[PDB]
Amino acid sequence: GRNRGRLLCMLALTFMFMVLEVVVSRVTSSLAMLSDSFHMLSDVLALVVALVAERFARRTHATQKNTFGWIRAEVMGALVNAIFLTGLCFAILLEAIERFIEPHEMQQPLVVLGVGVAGLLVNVLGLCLFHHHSDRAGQLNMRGVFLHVLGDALGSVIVVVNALVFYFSWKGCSEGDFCVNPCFPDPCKAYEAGPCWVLYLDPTLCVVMVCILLYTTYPLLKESALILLQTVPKQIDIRNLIKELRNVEGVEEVHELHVWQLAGSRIIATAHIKCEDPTSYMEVAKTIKDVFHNHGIHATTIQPEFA
Amino acid sequence: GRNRGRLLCMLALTFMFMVLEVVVSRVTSSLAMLSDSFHMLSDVLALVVALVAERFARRTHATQKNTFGWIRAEVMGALVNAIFLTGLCFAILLEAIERFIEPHEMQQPLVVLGVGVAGLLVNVLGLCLFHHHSDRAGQLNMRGVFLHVLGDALGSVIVVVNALVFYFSWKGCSEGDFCVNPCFPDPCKAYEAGPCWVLYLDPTLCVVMVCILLYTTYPLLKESALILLQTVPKQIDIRNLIKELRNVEGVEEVHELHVWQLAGSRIIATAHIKCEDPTSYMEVAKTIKDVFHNHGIHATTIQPEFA
Ligand SMILES: COC(=O)[C@]12CCC(C)(C)C[C@H]1[C@@H]1C(=O)C=C3[C@@]4(C)C=C(C#N)C(=O)C(C)(C)[C@@H]4CC[C@@]3(C)[C@]1(C)CC2
Numbered sequence: 001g002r003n004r005g006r007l008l009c010m011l012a013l014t015f016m017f018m019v020l021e022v023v024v025s026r027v028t029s030s031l032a033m034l035s036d037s038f039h040m041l042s043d044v045l046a047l048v049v050a051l052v053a054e055r056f057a058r059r060t061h062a063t064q065k066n067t068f069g070w071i072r073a074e075v076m077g078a079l080v081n082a083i084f085l086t087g088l089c090f091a092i093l094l095e096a097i098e099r100f101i102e103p104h105e106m107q108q109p110l111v112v113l114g115v116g117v118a119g120l121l122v123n124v125l126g127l128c129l130f131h132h133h134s135d136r137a138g139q140l141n142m143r144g145v146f147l148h149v150l151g152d153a154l155g156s157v158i159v160v161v162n163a164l165v166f167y168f169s170w171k172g173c174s175e176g177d178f179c180v181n182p183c184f185p186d187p188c189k190a191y192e193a194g195p196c197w198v199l200y201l202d203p204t205l206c207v208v209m210v211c212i213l214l215y216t217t218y219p220l221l222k223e224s225a226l227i228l229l230q231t232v233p234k235q236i237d238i239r240n241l242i243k244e245l246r247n248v249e250g251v252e253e254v255h256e257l258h259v260w261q262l263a264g265s266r267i268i269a270t271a272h273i274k275c276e277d278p279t280s281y282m283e284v285a286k287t288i289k290d291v292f293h294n295h296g297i298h299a300t301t302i303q304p305e306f307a
Numbered sequence: 308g309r310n311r312g313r314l315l316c317m318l319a320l321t322f323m324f325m326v327l328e329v330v331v332s333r334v335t336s337s338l339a340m341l342s343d344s345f346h347m348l349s350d351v352l353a354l355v356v357a358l359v360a361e362r363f364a365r366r367t368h369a370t371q372k373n374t375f376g377w378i379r380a381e382v383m384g385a386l387v388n389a390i391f392l393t394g395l396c397f398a399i400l401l402e403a404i405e406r407f408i409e410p411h412e413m414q415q416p417l418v419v420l421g422v423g424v425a426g427l428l429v430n431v432l433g434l435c436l437f438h439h440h441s442d443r444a445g446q447l448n449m450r451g452v453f454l455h456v457l458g459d460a461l462g463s464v465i466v467v468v469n470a471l472v473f474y475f476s477w478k479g480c481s482e483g484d485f486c487v488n489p490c491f492p493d494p495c496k497a498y499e500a501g502p503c504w505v506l507y508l509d510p511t512l513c514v515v516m517v518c519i520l521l522y523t524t525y526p527l528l529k530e531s532a533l534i535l536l537q538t539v540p541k542q543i544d545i546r547n548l549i550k551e552l553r554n555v556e557g558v559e560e561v562h563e564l565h566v567w568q569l570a571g572s573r574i575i576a577t578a579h580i581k582c583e584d585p586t587s588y589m590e591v592a593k594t595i596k597d598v599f600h601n602h603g604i605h606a607t608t609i610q611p612e613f614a
C-alpha cells in the first residue's frame with residue numbers, strides 16, 4: 001500500500017527527471033545528454049521488477065498451480081535486482097577502465113552541475129523514502145531498489161564533485177585562441193591546456209563507486225540465494241533439534257528430517273518419526289508438535305512409520 | 308566429467324582468443340581492439356558461474372546446513388546466466404541505438420575480418436560442443452552457456468558480414484587526397500565519401516541480434532524461475548490427484564496438499580490425509596504410496612490426523 005505509493009511516486013519522479021534531461025538537452029544541443037538519459041533509463045527496469053514483485057506478493061492463495069502461493073515473488077525480485085545490479089556494475093567498471101586508458105575531455109560543466117544538483121536532491125529524497133528497509137520479505141525486496149537509489153545518488157555526488165573540479169581547476173586552453181592540450185593522446189592532429197591530472201578523476205572515483213556498490217550489495221544477494229536454495233535458517237539448530245526429538249518418549253529414531261524456509265518467518269519442516277504402538281499416537285504427535293513449536297518451526301508434517 | 312572438460316577447454320579457448328586479440332592489437336596500434344577484448348571478457352563470468360554450479364552439483368549430501376543437499380545449484384546457475392544475459396542484451400541495445408543516432412565510421416576491415424573468422428570458427432566449434440543440451444539439471448544449466456555461445460557466434464557472423472560490406476561498398480574517400488564525408492555529422496570541422504547508407508547496418512543488424520537473443524533466452528528463464536518458485540510441474544494433475552486420493556477407501560478428506568519440484572525428476576509431496584481407525588493404518592499408507600507412485604511423485608510424507 002504505502003510502499004506501493006512510494007514506488008509509484010519514485011518512478012514518476014524518474015520519468016519527470018528524464019523529461020527534464022531531454023528538455024535541457026534540447027537547449028544545450030548535446031548528444032551526451034541523450035546518452036546519459038538513455039543510461040539512467042535502466043532504473044525503470046528495477047522499479048518495474050519491484051512493482052510486479054509487490055503486486056504478486058498479495059497472492060497468498062492456494063491454486064491449481066504452485067499450491068504454496070506466490071509468496072517467493074519478493075525473494076525472486078530481490079535476487080533479480082541483485083544480479084542486475086552486479087551486471088550493471090561490471091559494465092560500468094568496463095567503461096571506467098576504458099575512459100581511464102583514454103581520458104576524454106569534459107563538456108558543459110555549468111549545466112552538468114545544474115542537472116547534477118537536480119539529480120542529487122531527487123535521489124536524496126528517494127533515499128530518505130527508502131530508508132525504513134536498510135513481514136521481512138518486504139524489506140528483503142526493497143533492499144534492491146535501495147541499493148539502486150544509493151548508486152544513483154552516489155553517481156550524482158561524483159558527477160557534481162567532478163563538475164566543480166573542472167570548474168575550479170581546468171582553464172582548459174583548447175579552443176578559440178592559441179590553445180592545445182599536451183595530455184590528450186591525439187586531438188585529431190595532422191598554449192598547452194591547464195593541469196590535466198584531473199582528467200583521470202572520473203574513472204579513479206567511479207572505481208570507488210563500484211567498489212562500495214559491490215561491497216554493499218553482496219549481503220543481499222547472499223541472503224537471497226541462500227533462501228532460494230532451501231537452506232536451513234540461521235536461527236534453529238539441527239544438532240540439538242534431532243537430539244531432543246530422539247530423547248522424546250515413544251520415538252525410536254528419525255528416518256529423514258527436512259527443514260527449509262518458504263519465504264520469511266513462516267518455515268516448514270517434515271520428519272519420519274517412528275513409534276511402536278498405534279493405539280496411542282496422538283499424544284506423541286502433540287508432544288513433537290510442541291517441541292517444534294518451542295524450537296521455532298510451526299508448519300509440521302510427521303509420518304509415523306510403524307513397525 | 309566430460310561436460311567439465313568441455314567447459315575447461317572452451318574457457319581455455321576463450322583466454323587464448325583474448326591473448327590473440329591483444330597480440331594483434333599490439334601490431335595494429337588500435338585501442339578499439341582493446342575495447343573489444345575487454346568486452347568479450349564478459350564470457351569468463353558466465354563460464355565460471357557454470358563451472359562452480361557443476362562443481363556444487365556433485366554435493367548431493369545431507370549436511371548440518373541445507374538438509375536437502377546442494378542440488379539446486381544447477382537451477383541457480385541457469386537463472387544467473389539468464390538474468391546476466393538479459394542485462395547484457397539491454398546494454399548492447401543501448402549502445403546500438405546510440406551508434407544508430409551517431410554513425411561512427413569503421414576501421415581496419417581486413418584485420419577485423421581475420422579476427423572475425425577466427426572468432427567464427429572458435430565459436431562454431433564451441434557451439435558444436437554445446438549442442439547435446441539444446442539428469443535434466445545438466446542441460447538446464449548448460450542452456451545458459453549455449454545461449455551465450457550462440458550470441459558469441461552471431462556477433463562473429465554479424466561483424467564478418469559488416470566487414471565484407473565495408474570491403475565491397477565503402478571506397479570511403481575520407482583521408483589523404485581531397486576527401487570528405489557528407490553523412491558524418493561533424494568530422495571535427497571548423498570529395499564526399501562513398502555510399503554512406505551502409506553506416507547504419509551495424510546497429511540495424513545488432514537490433515535483430517538482440518531480438519533473437521531475447522526470443523531464444525526467454526524459455527530458459529521462464530522454466531528456471533518457475534522451478535525456483537515451488538510451482539507444480541507440468542506433468543501431474545492436482546484436480547484428479549486429490550479426487551483419486553479422496554476416492555481411496557479409509558481416507559475421509561485431505562487438510563493440506565503440497566507438491567513441488569526439488570531440482571529435477573525427483574519431486575516431493577506432503578499431505579494431511581485423515582483416517583478413522585488407528586489399528587489399521589499401514590495398509591492405507593501403502594495404498595496412498597502406490598497411488599502417488601502411479602501418479603509420478605515418489606518422495607512422500609503423509610500424516611494421519613486421526614479423530
Ligand atoms: C544506471 O546507472 C546510472 O544511471 C548511474 C547512476 C545514476 C545517475 C547519477 C543519474 C547516472 C548514472 C551514473 C552517471 O552519473 C552517468 C554516467 C557517465 C556516462 C557520465 C559521464 C560524463 N561526463 C562519463 O563520461 C562516464 C565516466 C562514462 C559516466 C559513466 C557512469 C555513469 C553511466 C553512472 C555513474 C552510472 C550509474
Ligand SMILES: COC(=O)[C@]12CCC(C)(C)C[C@H]1[C@@H]1C(=O)C=C3[C@@]4(C)C=C(C#N)C(=O)C(C)(C)[C@@H]4CC[C@@]3(C)[C@]1(C)CC2
Pocket residue numbers: 343346347348349350395399402403406426458459460461462463466509510513
Ligand atoms: C559479451 O558479448 C560479446 O562479447 C559479443 C559477442 C561475442 C563477440 C563476437 C566476440 C564480441 C561481442 C560482440 C561484438 O562483435 C563486438 C561488439 C562491438 C563493440 C563492435 C564494434 C565494432 N566495430 C562496435 O562499434 C559496436 C557496434 C559498438 C559493437 C557492439 C556489440 C559488441 C560488444 C558485440 C556484438 C556484443 C556481443
